[PDB]
């Protein structure tokens, strides 16, 4: 890794934020130089605002072009909502079923692995003999694979004993009844 | 609740830039600037929508022109390098002779230039590998994913080699079947 020549970076983000689907929409145009946001257009505000000194000129210059400000204010409909509609089918309503597996580790530890699922809202529970274990449970938290699936690991610290049935239970919008995987001493 | 983000950048003096849509942290697509074609993150996205690729190039031209202005306006203040955190992990839990995928997840860095090499037993591997573009983060740093499909063997050992201006030396991230 050579070439210490100084770098200069410009980033544009148009963030459409949705609440209860189309019900409430907010549009955020952020302009960022060298990782610092310098000026933005917040649909809640309705005009450009400077975030740092560096952004002041653009705010004024763009604000003074009133035909553009209107284009922008409409964008929550012409862009944000329009786009929401086009993508919903394969994004908002994407459902992939988790795959669940159990296996022991040492540190004894039990490991529940839930992989390959979408969306990321999920509930994973441990059961000892059908008594939910709410303590001694340590989770890896959501992990985004980058391929539109998630994975996570939930660990139960426990000293097993034959005659004990451990269950990992998973709830997720992709399935109707919880998935369960059982592991025995 | 959800968020869609059209994210684009121009970088100087490298003269690199990208255009992409992000849904809740996932790439919907980006535009291949050279081929001027829309590249859907998952093939099946491409049958339920389309996008005017040329538009991206126009946007990138505006981005570049504005960069050039900001560069001078800042009086040539350069970006500060932020080295990434790197993490290797598998698509699913590993069972020998069951095909899996190794994931190199490069995160929390800027500017968006990295070098990533897959190292099997210390040797470079390129067979079947793939990667993502630079994905956006709220603090304006970047994410990037590299992928290496593989057969889990007990003799085989793996490394993800990552270089970036914010690092004093390549960052190696190890993974073996244990």
């Amino acid at each position: 890794m050579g070439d210490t020549r100084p770098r200069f970076l410009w980033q544009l983000k148009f963030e459409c934020h949705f609440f209860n689907g189309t019900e409430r929409v907010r549009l955020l145009e952020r302009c960022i130089y060298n990782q610092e946001e310098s000026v933005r257009f917040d649909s809640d505000v309705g005009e450009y605002r400077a975030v740092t000194e560096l952004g002041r000129p653009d705010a004024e210059y763009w604000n003074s072009q009133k035909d553009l400000l209107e284009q922008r204010r409409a964008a929550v409909d012409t862009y944000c909502r329009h786009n929401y509609g086009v993508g919903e089918s394969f994004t908002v309503q994407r459902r992939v079923e988790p795959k669940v597996t159990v296996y022991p580790s040492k540190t004894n530890l039990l490991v529940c692995s839930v992989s390959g699922f979408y969306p990321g809202s999920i509930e994973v529970r441990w059961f000892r003999n059908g008594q939910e274990e709410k303590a001694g449970v340590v989770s890896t938290g959501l992990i985004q694979n980058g391929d539109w699936t998630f994975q996570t690991l939930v660990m139960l610290e426990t000293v097993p004993r034959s005659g004990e049935v451990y269950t990992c239970q998973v709830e997720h919008p992709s399935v109707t009844s919880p998935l369960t995987v059982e592991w025995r001493a | 609740e959800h968020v869609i983000i059209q994210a684009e950048f121009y970088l100087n003096p490298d003269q690199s830039g990208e255009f992409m849509f992000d849904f809740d942290g996932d790439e919907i697509f980006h535009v291949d600037m050279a081929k001027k074609e829309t590249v859907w993150r998952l093939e099946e996205f491409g049958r339920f929508a389309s996008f005017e690729a040329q538009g991206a190039l126009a946007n990138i031209a505006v981005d570049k022109a504005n960069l050039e202005i900001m560069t001078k306006r800042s009086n040539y203040t350069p970006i500060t390098n932020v080295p990434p955190e790197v993490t290797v992990l598998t698509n699913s839990p590993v069972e020998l002779r069951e095909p899996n995928v190794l994931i190199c997840f490069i995160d929390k860095f800027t500017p968006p230039v990295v070098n990533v090499t897959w190292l099997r037993n210390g040797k470079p591997v390129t067979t079947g590998v793939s990667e993502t573009v630079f994905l956006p983060r709220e603090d304006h740093l970047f994410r990037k994913f590299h992928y290496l499909p593989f057969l889990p063997s007990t003799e085989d050992v793996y490394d993800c080699r990552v270089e970036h201006w914010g690092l004093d030396e390549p960052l190696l991230k190890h993974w073996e079947f244990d």
Binding site: E29, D58, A75, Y79, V86 | F21, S50, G55, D63, I69
Partner: peptide
């Protein structure tokens, strides 16, 4: 068709 939003140009002859 998915819609693109277009960034504004900055003032080229600055004050």
């Amino acid at each position: 068709k998915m819609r693109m939003a277009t960034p504004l140009l900055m003032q080229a002859l600055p004050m």
